[PDB]
Amino acid sequence: KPTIYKFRIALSDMNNDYYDSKNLTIALHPSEKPQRMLARILAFCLNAQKDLEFTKTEEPDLWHVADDQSITHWIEIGEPEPDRIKKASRLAKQVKVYTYNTKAPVWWEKMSGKFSMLPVSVESFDYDAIDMICQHLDRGTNLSVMITGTSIFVDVNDQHVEVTVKELQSH
């Protein structure tokens, strides 16, 4: 059965001067891991002004469809293949990649040349910090996300965890 998570988030983006309170309800399946779910939320927190939306595997993780049905923003969470981002870069105006695993530095060392031939941004999350936030996640968890510099400070059940955002490719 799908595990139901409810997140009450108080957001503070001190880089873009954006403050909002988002309530999100996410469904989790034993196949998917809670670490990838949190990485999608952090990308939503980093790009909340884009009015993104979560998705239900070729479909992106987060996107914003305009009235012309043109994908304005494409947010992929994970370590995708360059051919996938190659297709996504044509369909979407802006494509941003957020990796969240420990294999990312080795993955980037092999995909650096191909991704340099794409007008996208590649940024990395600290996995162990995301794993930490997972351990203190209740079925219904009240989170507080603070964004400053190149790091994300998350308050989850009084526990404070810093998640660094390393830049691999700008745009």
Rounded CA separation 65/62 (Å): 10
Rounded CA separation 124/169 (Å): 10
Rounded CA separation 11/65 (Å): 23
Q: Which H, E and C letters describe the chain, residue by residue?
A: CCEEEEEEEEEEECCCCEEEEEEEEEEECCCCCHHHHHHHHHHHHHCCCCCCEECCCCCCCEEEECCCCCEEEEEEECCCCHHHHHHHHHHEEEEEEEECCCCHHHHHHHHHHHHCCCCCEEEEECHHHHHHHHHCCCCEEEEEEEEECCEEEEEECCEEEEEEEEEEECC
Resolution of this model in Å is: 2.7
Rounded CA separation 86/28 (Å): 28
Listed by start position, the domains of the chain span 1-171
Tell me how the structure was determined.
Answer: X-ray
